[PDB]
Amino acid sequence: CKPKGAPCSPLMYPCCTGPCRSGKC
């Protein structure tokens, strides 16, 4: 799971905690 500060994609990179904050966790 993508950690805080990392780039998240609601499609391919789901944040560990909570939803993707529009580009980052």
User: Which structural domain, as residue segments, surrounds residue 25?
Assistant: 1-25
Cα–Cα distances in Å, from 23 out to 15, 18? 10, 13
Structural domain count of the chain: 1
The Cα–Cα gap between 17 and 14 comes to 9
| The two three-digit tokens of residue 22, written as one number | 């529009």
The answer to whether 23 and 13 are in contact (CB under 8 A) is no
Q: How was this structure determined?
A: NMR
The Cα–Cα gap between 25 and 17 comes to 8
The Cα–Cα gap between 16 and 13 comes to 9
